[PDB]
Amino acid sequence: FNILLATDSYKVTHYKQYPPNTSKVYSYFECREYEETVFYGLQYILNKYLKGKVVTKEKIQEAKDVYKEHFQDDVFNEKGWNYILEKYDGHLPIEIKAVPEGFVIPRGNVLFTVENTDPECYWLTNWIETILVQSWYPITVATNSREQKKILAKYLLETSGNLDGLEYKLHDFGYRGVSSQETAGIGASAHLVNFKGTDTVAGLALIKKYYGTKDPVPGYSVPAAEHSTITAWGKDHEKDAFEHIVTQFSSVPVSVVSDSYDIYNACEKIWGEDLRHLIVSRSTQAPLIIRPDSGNPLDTVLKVLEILGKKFPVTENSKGYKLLPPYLRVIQGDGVDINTLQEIVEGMKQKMWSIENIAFGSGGGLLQKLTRDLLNCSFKCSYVVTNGLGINVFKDPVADPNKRSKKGRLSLHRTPAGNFVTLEEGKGDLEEYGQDLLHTVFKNGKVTKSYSFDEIRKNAQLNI
Numbered sequence: 001f002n003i004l005l006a007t008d009s010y011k012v013t014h015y016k017q018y019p020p021n022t023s024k025v026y027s028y029f030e031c032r033e034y035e036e037t038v039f040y041g042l043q044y045i046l047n048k049y050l051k052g053k054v055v056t057k058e059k060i061q062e063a064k065d066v067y068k069e070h071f072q073d074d075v076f077n078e079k080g081w082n083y084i085l086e087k088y089d090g091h092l093p094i095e096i097k098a099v100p101e102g103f104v105i106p107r108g109n110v111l112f113t114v115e116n117t118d119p120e121c122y123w124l125t126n127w128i129e130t131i132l133v134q135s136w137y138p139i140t141v142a143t144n145s146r147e148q149k150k151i152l153a154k155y156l157l158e159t160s161g162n163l164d165g166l167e168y169k170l171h172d173f174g175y176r177g178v179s180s181q182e183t184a185g186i187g188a189s190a191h192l193v194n195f196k197g198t199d200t201v202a203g204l205a206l207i208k209k210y211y212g213t214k215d216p217v218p219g220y221s222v223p224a225a226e227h228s229t230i231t232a233w234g235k236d237h238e239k240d241a242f243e244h245i246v247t248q249f250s251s252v253p254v255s256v257v258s259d260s261y262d263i264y265n266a267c268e269k270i271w272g273e274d275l276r277h278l279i280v281s282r283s284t285q286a287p288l289i290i291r292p293d294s295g296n297p298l299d300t301v302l303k304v305l306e307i308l309g310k311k312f313p314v315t316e317n318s319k320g321y322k323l324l325p326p327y328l329r330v331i332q333g334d335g336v337d338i339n340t341l342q343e344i345v346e347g348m349k350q351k352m353w354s355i356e357n358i359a360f361g362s363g364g365g366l367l368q369k370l371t372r373d374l375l376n377c378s379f380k381c382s383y384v385v386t387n388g389l390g391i392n393v394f395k396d397p398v399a400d401p402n403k404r405s406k407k408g409r410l411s412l413h414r415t416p417a418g419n420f421v422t423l424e425e426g427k428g429d430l431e432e433y434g435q436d437l438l439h440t441v442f443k444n445g446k447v448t449k450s451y452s453f454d455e456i457r458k459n460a461q462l463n464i
């Protein structure tokens with residue numbers, strides 16, 4: 001990894017563009033006006049890419065050679081980078097102040113600030129914008145996952161009277177559906193801020209290495225079938241496949257994909273009749289989890305529940321909602337995103353089915369179908385020092401008032417009613433509000449403040 005080659009190309013030319021005599025460039029990150037965001041992921045980026053000796057004579061020579069060919073000209077700031085190498089043993093003369101990780105902040109508030117600590121390195125602040133802006137992804141995954149937890153919490157409480165099993169209601173199936181191995185780990189870890197069920201193993205190592213938990217692992221899974229383990233038995237032997245799998249995992253929960261040929265037939269005739277004797281004998285701690293995987297998500301769920309309700313003893317809970325026996329549950333793991341999740345639980349409630357009957361699996365919808373535009377995650381310069389005088393800087397496009405940026409030195413405060421406010425133009429220096437919620441997390445190549453994954457989880461908790 002070479003930090004000199006980890007920026008947008010045009011940034012290589014920006015040191016020549018700033019006003020002459022600029023000693024300080026101060027920039028901030030916000031999710032511009034999903035009403036609130038989970039702040040998560042910066043700690044991973046600081047440790048992996050920004051801390052320690054990030055500059056070497058070899059890295060400078062390597063970058064010089066690449067940029068000479070890439071621009072077909074000598075534009076690369078070799079003097080500036082050689083200065084950091086000689087003066088600071090290749091450590092970044094940068095200060096990063098950030099809100100604590102797991103903090104739930106309303107939109108349009110400062111989440112972190114970046115500034116150079118040496119006047120010669122005025123250009124460094126925005127050089128590292130590209131690396132830092134990538135924190136949009138764990139922020140958005142964590143925020144979207146938490147919003148789905150809010151929907152599940154609302155309907156589980158309404159249909160059952162409690163939140164039992166809530167942290168296992170949305171399982172991460174997204175490993176194959178993401179753009180890379182690195183994305184898989186970052187995304188899976190952001191989902192684990194809110195839930196405990198994951199199939200994306202990559203998230204486990206990332207948490208252990210960069211955040212840490214008191215528990216041996218942050219996430220869990222159970223044995224489950226896939227189309228290949230069912231279809232390898234042959235079309236006429238689906239019953240033999242099901243019997244073998246539930247017998248191999250007789251004492252643990254087991255999920256079985258039942259839609260290879262005909263989901264309604266598997267529920268009614270295979271599970272509901274032929275293998276019913278292997279289901280009713282199961283423990284409350286080892287249910288069979290029927291998994292539909294195609295068709296209209298809501299229509300399939302309701303039809304599967306009506307079939308199961310007629311083949312198995314259904315009870316009515318204290319809220320008047322239908323509950324399957326404890327050895328039988330359903331997992332819907334196809335076509336699940338925040339919109340369809342809401343349609344399913346609302347459809348179940350209208351048909352008097354408790355949310356305790358169902359769990360969800362989400363792949364692409366959870367980890368890939370998200371962009372930086374969803375929460376409007378943006379990094380902009382708000383303050384510069386030129387000829388020793390500080391000036392408030394901002395953009396305000398005529399055609400888009402929503403793109404107007406904040407001015408001057410920023411701070412985040414608790415209001416008297418306990419909400420959040422971002423103070424602009426260094427107004428935080430007037431002690432009219434409490435202490436600034438931003439802490440120095442990075443300074444001069446060192447990580448100065450860290451959070452464990454348990455602290456993040458506590459900070460990201462729902463109000464309910």
Ligand SMILES: O=C1OCCC/C1=C\Nc1ccccc1
Pocket residue numbers: 171172173174175199221222223224225255256289291331333361363
């Ligand atoms: O069905 C299941 O029930 C619960 C345990 C995991 C599981 C399925 N996992 C999965 C992973 C990646 C793609 C598809 C499914």
